[PDB]
Each structure stands twice: as C-alpha cells, then as structure tokens.
Design a binder for this molecule. Structure first.
Ligand code: 34X
Ligand code: 34X
Lengths: 236, 245, 240, 231
C-alpha cells in the first residue's frame, strides 16, 4: 500500500553526478539497495561516499557499458555480493554513430540483467534519454534522433519481455539544470528558456521522481512508454 | 508547516465521474495522499454514492452533482466548492459522456468541449495560487471491433493534442496539464463480454492481463504530486504494452 | 457563380474537383494543379469578388471550371453550393478543404467545417464508389502552441475519417505545410528570414506549387492505397 | 511534368515484388534504371524485365551488408552508366533488435556511398522502403526507419537532397499469397479499404517522391497501408 522499494536491488549507470546521482538517491530514498556506476575508480568511490552521506545502502562500481566483459563481470560481482538487480536504470550515455552506440549499450546491458528478472518474474528497466543542450544545428538532429531511437527501442523491448512482468520505460528529459548545461553560453541558455512554457530549467530531482515512480509496483501497467519531462518544450 | 514527497495535504482536488471504476479509484487515491476530495457524477444518487465511499474510506471531501456539458452547472458547482471547501488546485477530468466507426466525431468533439469548459473555469483559481494540476483521463477500450478502434484512436489523438496545447498556454503559471491513456482496464464493460472473444484481448497485451483501476489511479496520483512538476503536456499510456493509434 | 490540345498530364480527366479557399496562395496553386491534371475545377471563396477572381484565374490558365461563393461554416451554404454544382457541373469526387483561448476555438471551428463539408460530399462519392478528400493544414503562424495542436487535430481527424469511409474506396488524407512562400513571408527583415531559413534543412521556403503537387498526387489513382495519412511538406523542419 | 529523363536511378532488391514494381515505375518516368539483387540469376532476371519493358538500365549483383560490394558496385555504375541521383533502398535483410540494427547499418552504408555523387550534382533523392512476433518487429522497424530518415534528411538537406521513406502496409506479394483464408480475411477486416495493396501502388508513391514536384518533401515517412495503422 506504498511505493517502497525495500528489499529490491537497483543498478543505476552513470551515477557520479547530475541526473544519475539524483536517480540513485531517489531510489535509495524509496528503500532500494543501490549500486551506482561510473567509468573510473574515483567516480565509483565518489558514488559510495554520496550513498553513505545520504544513508543509502549500496555500492559504487566501475562499469563500461560499451564492453561485454565489463558488463558480464560487473553483474557477477553484484550477484555474488548484493543479490540480483531487479531495477535497472540506464543513464550512462555524428548522429548515426552516437545513436547506434547508445542503443547497442542499452541492449547489451538490458539483455544481461534480463536473466535475473526473468527468474524473479518481476523487473523494471528504465532508460534515460539525452538531455537537451546541443551546441548547434547538429545538436537538434542529434537530440531528435536519440529520442526517436530510445522510444522505438523501449517500446520494442517492452513487447518482448512483457509476458514476464517486466516493465521497460524511458524518460526523455528536456532542459535540465546540470553541471553540463550551466556551462553553456548565455545566448544559448536563454533561447532555450524562451522555448519552455514553464519558463525554467528542470531539476535533476524532477527527473528522478519520475524514475522513482516508474520503478514502483504502482507503475506495473506502464510499459513501452516514454515519459517526457521537459516543462512543455517538445522537440522532434 | 509540512513537506514530504507524495503528500497532497492542504490541497483540494476535483475528480469528475467518480461514482465508479477509474474515477472512483482516482478519488480514493488522491484521498489516500491527503487531498480533500470532491468527486462528481451527473445524478443525485451518484453523488450520494461518492460521499458514502469517501466516508467509508476516511477521506475528507464531498459528492456533488455536476454536468460538465453545461456552463451553468460548472460555474455553480465551482462556486459551491469555493464557498465551502476552498479552491480546487488539482482537477482530474474523467467524466467522458453498440457503437460504430462513425460516432467518433461527436464523441470526441463533445468530450473536448467539456474539457475546455471545465479547465478554463478552474484556471482562474490555479492562476491566483500560481500552482495547479490538470489531469485528463482518456477513454478505455469500449469495443473490440473496427468501430471500437476508430473511436479509441480518435479519442486518444484528440486528448493528446488538446493536453499538449493547453499545457503550453498555462505553463508560465506553474500549472501542469497532463493526460493518462488507459488501455484495457478491468471495469463494468470488460467483465460482461464473454471470454473467448475477450480472452483474445489478453493475447494483444504483452503483460498478458487487464489493468486495474488502481493502476490508473497511481499514475494520476503521481502526476498530481510536486515531484511531477516538470512533466507537462504529456500523455502517459497505461496499457500493458498494447499500443493502438 | 461564374464559369484541341490533349496534354499528357491530364490524368484527372472526367473528374470534378472542389477546392475551398482558392482565391490565393496554396488554394489557388491547388486549383491550377488539379486543372493541369485535367480535372474540372470548382474553386471557392467567401465573397463574390473572391469567386470572380477564381474564375478569371481559371480561364486565364485554360482550366474548365468555376468560382463559387461558399461559407464552409454554414450548413445552408454547403448544401446549396453542392446542389448548384450537381445540377450544373456534376458530382465532385475530389475535394480539397483548404478554407480556414484562440488555440482551442481555431481548431474546433476548423474541424467542424471539415466534417460538415466532408459529410456533405460523401453521398456523391459513395454512389460513385470512388473519392478523394484532402485536407490542407495550418501553415506556420504563441504560433508554436497552435501549430502542434492544429496538426494533431488534423491528423487524428483525417485518420478517423479515412477508417469510416474506406470501405467505399474513398481515400482521406492531409497535407501539413511547413514554411511556405506567401506574400506575407516575403516581407520579413533579413535577420528574421535568415533565422527561419536556418531552421529549415533545405535552406529555403517552400513554394505553394510544391504543396499543390502533393495534393495532385494524392488525388490520383496511383495514390489509391494511401489513406488516413498526413504528408508533411516542410523542407525538413518538424515542429512538435 | 513528372519526368526523370536523364537521371540514373538505383533500386536495391528489384528482382520481384515491390522493388520490381519500383524499377518499372522509375523506368516508365524516363529514368535509366539499375536494379539489384543478391544473386546472379536475380540480376539476370532484372535485366530481362527491363529490356522486356523497354527500360534502359542494368541488373547488378549487390549485397548492401558489405562495404566492398557497395564500393565496387557503385564504381561499376559510375564508370559505365553515370552517377545515380535517385536511390531507393528496398533490399531488406533478440531478433527485433538485430534485424533493425542490421537494416539501418545497410541504409547508412549505401546512403553515405551515393551521397558523394548527389552532393556533386547538387540534387538527389533517397527513398527507403519499409518492411511489409510480428507487431514488435514491424513497429520497431518502422520507428527506426522514421527517425533515421528524418535525421539523414536534416543532415543532407542543404544540398537539395531529399530523403524520404515509404511504409507499406499489407501488400499483395509472394509472402502474402501463402496465408489461410480465415487469417487473410481477418487481416482484410483490419484494413478500411478492405483489400491488399498492390506493389504498383507503393511504386507510384516512390515515383512521386523522386520527382521535382516533391522537392519540399524531406524527412517524411509516407504510410501506404489502406488505413491500417499499427504502432
Ligand atoms: N542503430 C540505430 N540507429 C538508429 C537511429 C538513428 C537515428 C534515428 C533513429 C534511430 C537506431 N538504431 N537503432 C537500432 O540499432 N535499433 C533500433 C532503433 C529503433 C527501434 C528499435 C531498434 F531496435
Ligand atoms: N472536433 C474534434 N475532433 C477532434 C479530433 C478527432 C479525431 C482525432 C483527434 C481529434 C478534435 N476535435 N476538437 C477540438 O476542439 N480540438 C482539438 C482537436 C485535436 C487536437 C487539439 C484540439 F484543440
């Protein structure tokens, strides 16, 4: 009668900063045991501090989602130590190659965690889209493309794994206040505020709450869906 | 002076079409989250029933008679609420008013005129408070034929473009506007068409089951929260993986 | 009410086409294109001088047809107009709707007009067991809210109507123009035009004719299996 | 004014069905047409069909999954018939993912290879034909085709090159002719037009998209499905 993720293990890729960090803390707040990942040892260490610092049981690991070996080994380490990850949030990220590489990483990781979810006959996979913030024309092409790829992928994977009570969903952030976007040139940021009906940048936490909800038992009938979290700014 | 993640304490919510099924489940969910809940129906016995259900589940609120097709009804109803309980800052439109692939136009036209009516009327209150949630519930799947698809696809497309457009119009005032597009939900309609044809429905749904009314309500419950503040103009499908447009 | 070279393009020979809002721009271009393809063309406008002008343009480009006064918002106008056409020129089997808190009322009013007119021409197409209905969208023109909405409305409508009339071999389609060269857009300050062109991959405004060719195609027998579709004609500029 | 006289068109997977119909339609419009197939007997057949319908062109062996095949094939065309400015990708190829990933890698391979020619001529048409268990794979292939087509259109647009897709519904082809009557009729029952589409009816759309009249259409995916939409 609640959104408690007590007893569940969650894996959040790219958790050392920004959105991923905010997602790790939110799932922690909800009672999940949280494994966050980064590509470096110091990133993984930092994830661990942040967890203790906010009273979250879990760990930081080194993970490169572009390589089969890293993925296989990492998942093994988790299984042997903390249990099977039943919540998995892919947040660790020229148009063609970017999208092709991202989606190969989603599929890789998703397929690897699926054996565990299948066995438990329950699971949540949640895919975070790229943030809006794209120095140029290139960057609109790239965001629209990444979004279309995420959506069709998420929908297709949901249909494939649905019969096992595993939901698969995506979250498509708009213009979010992050360490990356605070660095954009003022003209570019203001031109983006001018496009957003809510008249402000979204917070990382505001992405994390959606992920938090999608991970809950309450969201059990939501699958193959891509939830936009963009303040009313839609770009396609 | 309180503050927690999903609370709606201190907020007044208005849920149209709350006497049964989805709307009832929504009223109880917003109640469960601490909202003062006004549910509505088109009849006195419906409104009575809403009130019983609230008290019976310990929810502070009321049942009112409301016809969303009529300006007078809407104006008067909102007045009563303002006079007595305060300003409704959460508003969930769920009162949509043998069917064939030609009835689509009128159904959708009538629904959307009612959304706009009610929405515009509650907007003055939300504007004044510089905060608000409007949530629009789509039609469930009401017939499994061609007739039934045309109508569901159409109702969905209309709801989505409407919700998006309205979100853009009111966004600058910190008012989110969202929709929920239920798929095949366990309700009065779905239960009574015998199974050999109904069971064929489960085969179209990857989750392999009908959705529960509660499962729509949790989504509405989330969208109404402060956590969902950056979600606007969105239509959340809640269909077990069955997508049709 | 104002009314031997065999060109090869003349594939809509023998068909009567009705193009609403034909006195200028896109609608005018559509009337001449369907004319070019051999259709007998009735174009419409809301005023007598508009209808006069349509007729001049037709004769001036050697198109058999007429200019009529039509108000698509009124049942009487529609019924009477269609009857005049039936009694004089035959049954219109190709029909192109191009004649158009603001955000809601615009879309609601348009779609009520589409449905009115569409339902009225449908008896004729049903009897002939063939027909083309083509709906021209809102061009670009606060303007962002309205364009996405108008588009979503047009598209769901077009799709739903296609499903309803399909069994009778009547296609129903829409065309969603992007930024089209019209007499208003030619007058922007260079900075404004260049900034708009910078959003369009083709790097130019579309021509009215370029909308008309799509309509021309959709009207043909070749497009018989295309129905409930909305064809964007925007130079690669997609707004949501 | 639908003419393609003087233009060279390349149609992959042209030995039968849709691709064949596309090759004859672009031929009918005056294009010099190179059709392709994966086998020698397929390529021969393409050539017979062209001569048999008075179309100037050729049948070539092409495997769009291989860089070498593509590079060599395009060279042969450049050296013999000129630069292909109209290009229609119709040769299609845990199963959903790989299908779509492989198809889109083939589109991108071929597209990039023909793009040099179009850039040089400052004009071009690229048209991608979609696929004709089964919903997951169709919805996925479609979503991939659409986003791809749109993204590529944005990239090459400034050079007066349109890039578009055609998403056929249920078409009368060698696959569909094999279904049991109850199953096909249940499929007709989902199609408002009440019939299967013809290959020619896909081809006319391609024919139109290739024309100068369609110059302002780019990044678009035209459904050709008799009113049956599955997503
Ligand atoms: N390799 C690749 N490129 C793209 C793509 C590029 C631009 C826009 C949209 C998709 C998508 N993908 N996607 C895939 O590999 N798989 C994929 C794409 C869409 C739906 C389902 C899929 F599996
Ligand atoms: N009369 C009508 N029909 C439809 C419609 C029909 C089929 C699919 C989608 C919308 C919508 N509407 N009415 C509206 O007032 N507005 C409207 C429709 C679609 C999107 C946005 C809108 F404001």
């Amino acid at each position: 009668q609640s959104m408690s993720l007590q007893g569940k293990v969650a894996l959040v890729t790219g958790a050392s900063r920004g959105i991923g960090q905010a997602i790790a803390l939110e799932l922690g707040r909800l009672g999940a045991v949280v494994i966050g990942t980064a590509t470096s040892a110091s990133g993984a260490e930092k994830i661990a501090e942040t967890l203790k610092a906010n009273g979250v049981e879990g760990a930081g690991l080194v993970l490169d989602v572009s390589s089969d070996e890293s993925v296989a080994a990492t998942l093994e380490h988790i299984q042997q130590h903390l249990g099977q990850p039943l919540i998995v949030v892919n947040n660790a990220g020229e148009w063609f190659d970017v999208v092709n590489t991202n989606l190969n990483s989603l599929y890789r990781l998703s397929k690897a965690v699926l054996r565990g979810m299948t066995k438990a006959r329950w699971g949540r996979i949640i895919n975070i889209g790229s943030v809006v913030g794209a120095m140029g024309n290139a960057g609109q092409t790239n965001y629209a493309a990444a979004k279309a790829g995420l959506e069709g992928f998420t929908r297709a994977l949901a249909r494939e794994v649905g019969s096992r009570a595993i939901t698969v969903n995506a979250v498509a952030p708009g213009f979010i206040d992050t360490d990356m976007t605070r660095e954009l040139p003022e003209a570019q940021r203001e031109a983006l505020l001018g496009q957003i009906p809510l008249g402000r940048l979204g917070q990382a936490e505001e992405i994390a709450k959606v992920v938090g909800f999608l991970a809950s038992d309450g969201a059990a009938y939501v699958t193959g869906a891509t939830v936009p979290v963009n303040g009313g700014m839609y770009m396609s």
